[PDB]
């Protein structure tokens with residue numbers, strides 16, 4: 080279904096970015112930045128300042144290890160989806 | 168992008184089921200049941216017993232109003248996505 084296909088797109092997109100550097104199952108700041116700029120260009124403003132990257136990661140990083148793991152990424156998708164929902 | 172398209176599929180699918188009866192922005196038990204059986208047939212077992220529907224709703228209904236609103240639905244998608252992630 081469309082729902083099942085959206086679930087796999089979430090996993091696919093996370094894995095495309097998390098495996099580029101260092102830990103293959105987590106997003107460090109540079110991976111998280113490219114995911115936003117390449118895949119969220121219609122919803123979010125392009126990130127160019129280091130301070131914005133730093134702030135986004137602080138916001139998402141719940142277990143405070145400095146990286147975004149798959150749960151924290153899902154919390155981010157929820158925030159974006161919810162915001163979109165509410166706009167419309 | 169594939170990510171942006173998965174975000175809109177989440178909103179689209181929720182709205183297809185939440186607007187069938189009563190409150191148009193929430194899922195009551197009968198809407199939640201048909202969403203599962205029609206759209207999650209590859210990941211979840213078909214729901215046939217009332218007790219299973221009741222249990223799923225209790226689990227998802229955080230604000231305890233007996234219905235699944237768009238936030239609680241997003242918490243459900245996270246649980247399914249996460250489970251899929253972990254299986255593989």
Ligand SMILES: [Ca+2]
Nearest residue numbers: 097100102105
């Ligand atoms: Ca990584």
Ligand SMILES: [Ca+2]
Nearest residue numbers: 140142144146
């Ligand atoms: Ca973390």
Ligand SMILES: [Ca+2]
Nearest residue numbers: 185188190193
């Ligand atoms: Ca409804």
Ligand SMILES: [Ca+2]
Nearest residue numbers: 228230232234
């Ligand atoms: Ca509720």
